[model samples]
Target: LPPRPWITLKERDSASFTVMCYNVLCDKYATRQLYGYCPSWALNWEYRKKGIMEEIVNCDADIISLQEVETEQYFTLFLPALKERGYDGFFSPKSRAKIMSEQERKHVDGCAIFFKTEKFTLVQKHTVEFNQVAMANSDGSEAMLNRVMTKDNIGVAVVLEVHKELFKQLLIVANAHMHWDPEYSDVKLIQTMMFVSEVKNILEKASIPLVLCADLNSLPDSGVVEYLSNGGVADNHKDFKERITHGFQLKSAYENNLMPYTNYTFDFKGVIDYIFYSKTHMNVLGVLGPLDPQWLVENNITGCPHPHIPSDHFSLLTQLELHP
Candidate 1:
């Protein structure tokens, strides 16, 4: 028998849906120095701004949750394309932490959601402010802001009141981008926990089916991912091995193909991007993609060829069926 070609199961609109999570590495070639040590010019500002939208459209996602959108132009270019593709989206710019000397501190860049208008409706929007002041270290010093101030991450939860005759209730879709410091993982975890806990509490009371997606910087094996999943969140890309290998144990898992690529959203030697959800609301299809390799190569314009051009991260696409 021949090897089975990768194929996704088709659904018959019985409230079936698909969702994606990605960190479309915001166009911030100028600010790359603040994050880490790097080879100079690892990002090309011009190509990134133009190419990212095209790359995103190529994925053909129904609902896309994105992180690290740095400028208004990013949306100016991308949102309309989404509209052209039949999606209407809401974007929350990162809120300013503080203004020093009247120079606006561009705090947040891009945290947004683009949903297929035919499939969902935008009912309500909310943003969660991660209070770093409340997040203090053992000695009482601030933990999250040791390096840079943390902007409030945005969570846009759209209530898709299903139009089908049998499905009457709302299907909640929430999007977010978590903090990236390994040192402040606990702080980020608590912040995310508190925010989602409140959301869950409210939604549970309303009795709605929910799908939460994000570019949670943590990897699948990390305690944060485990914590979120254990708390009823399921990552769609847990099956893809080609996109998950790192080194040692992570590599061993990859070699045997024991790991799946379904949730493999990004590759920086490993998959750190993810799309997580509640198990009770819907049945999740496998996650997919590093996308077309040519787009990946063309957009990575920096001399060192950083992935930020096409987006420093890859996209994770998932299919699901919403229940009434």
Candidate 2:
């Protein structure tokens, strides 16, 4: 094929407010599964949290969604620090204990969502367990059954009231961290399918625009992206808008996907984390993350949890221009 340019993108001004999502790599509750590395104590709580706070503050995000936050870090460090920045935090950990020990469960880690109190008024918060979602779809495939029986992934939706002029807009920001075991793509598949249903259910009670942030652990061309881009919810669902492709109607972390890769580690690397917005009420101004994943591919720091990269995953700092 001859050299050719594809896809045209118009330049736009940055949005007044921004939303950033990241996986902070919790200190105490380190689960160094296969394909992930680094001494559990490399980024100790004191130093790691300091670096994380620096990164978050630098992004100047108005809203934030994060994964792998330990209870210890949440109460003592992450929560307090964000609150100090005028952010109200909402948390949703796995419905079932990841650890078998009751004592261990007390300090388990999961998702953390936050919003700038001064910028937007908190309207509501909702949490859903993937286990129930999978079970609800009775007579589904074995994979679905397996997912529910195995893990306790969870999701959070924070409703915010954004006002401009004489109009008030209800904005629902949902965030989640999906399964990671590559063998469980079936689990990821059903989870993605059910998430839309849950979020759409929320939209029905109240009229609002929807945006989703997730470390879905799914890849491009996979069921996760497929369901996310196109509707998997019932055709009659209220908030079930048209297909929301990552780079098309719903602009992705990178404009036109200049570098559609976020997960960076020795074992795996690809675009998995995402920030999606409604095509009708949102415009993507820009996205910030690893400029070049190659930076992770061939450097002194081969593989996460690298000291520089912070986590095995990359932070998606997306600037969305919100419109009523």
Candidate 3:
């Protein structure tokens, strides 16, 4: 854990909060074949889980959005540990859970969002099954059936009332883990569009501030970032054959302070995780600085699952202040 100093953007006392978004690579997926370079001990869940738990607790975020959270582990470990720390959370497993056997279900991982119990009260929670949504609206076209519905990625949306001096404020937060295959950019784009639409539905008839966090698995130049930041992607774009649009005006919290790579690996390393917030409702107050690339190179830190870092992706933490 390097010293990541907070770079403040505004010095205000309005209902400010901290957010941490991370993809703590699921234990089931941390196989020796994938992370061959990692020492067997470092890859062991017994060792990795403790480090992950400690980092989460030490980050001290008001709202924590985590991806790759296994279902059984969430109940036996994280839920209990985080509860003892005065936090309450909700977990949504990937869409394939229903079809999986009881034994298989324990290995399925998804997204989890935990908020400080005393600081925020849950108003509503919605689980978005991208696969199911695509199926329900299917046109029976081959693309709809095979291209989209086959992926089991999932997302979770929650609206919370934040404690404030003299009054409470409403906030909408969403966490998503998109499909990982780069060859299927079309699938990821569809999931992105569907995710935004799902969040929009959660914000119906309200002007609640939004904090969307995820391991999108798309590069900074991918359609996912383009659509979210620009609010629309042209129909003719190389990756997206269909036009996609949204109304939420967003800006990445790390736009000016991005890490060298959020998902680091021996063969692949780039930015894929993000914390996007509504520009109209909130102001960026501060962001946790990125790891020192110089230090990493010096230490031969080619990828994650390192003795110190617990996941493949580095955590993105930010501080934000709600506008009056």
Candidate 4:
């Protein structure tokens, strides 16, 4: 059983839910082009797919959100695996599918969202596409589009509910893979602005709690995630104190010191991946993966994507208890 969180509620009515966010590095790129040092075996999608599945099956996140999964793989290999696990899912590839070669289109990457059918009811579903310029119609004819728009960067927001009316509450899990170019913080900020606005719109309508999971290329130190919890980047939360900006609260599992790091690649190693929650309605019970750097040293294992770590990036499992 997942550990239960100690909370302040008397009797602490609760429901346990596990979530996993993984970027199972797709097999389409050349070795040098890949973010981290990937072994020759990494080129074999079939080999990497099996290894990635092994990690997913073992982690046991009730709701799973994955990034960088090739479109064809999701339909032909990835989605079916989730179905066998008794999950219902949705997949969306980046919209630039036409420009790629037949092979590229077939394997173009995107995000996938899955939920255990027995554990949660699907209340509603939506996707926030951060690809286009703000107020720019997606005609593809616009002179200049958001830099991130070239690749399909988006957020998968699904509203879920428990079948047991006695202990149920609506929950929103927004899964995203943001812009990757560190050189252009402006581009990332643009993507972040549009993404945060859409999520807040959801809350305005439903008053539901949220869990925002992603491989945000931006780091914790940049204050991007915290700005999401607030209405915008300015920390207007202070000046707007007399008024209401948002019913906002967020707890980043790793940021809270629950774990040291999520992605342990050689090029970039920091908390690029995250699972953020609404503190008013949820509590993080426990977390897993993020192998201690010391352990990696003792094993003499160099950068991950080595024989055992599965993907170049390690998976993160966060246990959460939703308030009743």
Name the candidate that leads on TM-score: 3
Which order, best to worst by TM-score?
A: 3, 4, 2, 1
In model 3, what lDDT does residue 208 have? 74
Q: Would you list the rank order by lDDT, best first?
A: 3, 4, 2, 1
Clashes of 4: 0
Cα lDDT tens digits for candidate 2, 178-287: 87877777667666666767888777777356778888887766666766666443433322211332222343545345545677667677888888877767766666
TM-score of each: 0.70, 0.82, 0.95, 0.83
Q: Positional deviation of 280 in candidate 1, in angstroms?
A: 1.6
Number of backbone clashes in candidate 3: 0
> Residue-wise lDDT of candidate 1 within 25-86, one digit each (tens)?
65553354532433334455565555566657766777788777654554556676678889
Candidates in order have lDDT scores of 0.54, 0.69, 0.88, 0.70
Candidate scoring better on TM-score of 1 and 4: 4
Model 1 residue 91 lDDT score: 72
Candidate 4 lDDT for residue 121: 83
Tell me the spans in candidate 1 whose CA falls farther than 4 Å from its real position: 1-13, 29-42, 100-107, 132-152, 165-167, 201-206, 232-268, 290-309
Q: Which residue ranges in model 3 land beyond 4 Å of their true spot?
A: 166-168, 241-243
TM accuracy, model 3 = 0.95
lDDT of 4 by residue, 1-324 (tens): 122232222223368778889988877652555644656765466666777898888777898989888888889887898889988887878765257687768767888888898888888787777755443644563422534456467777888886574354688888888877776555565566666668878766764778888888867666466565554455343311212233457777656544455666676567778888888888777777446566678876666566566666677777787875
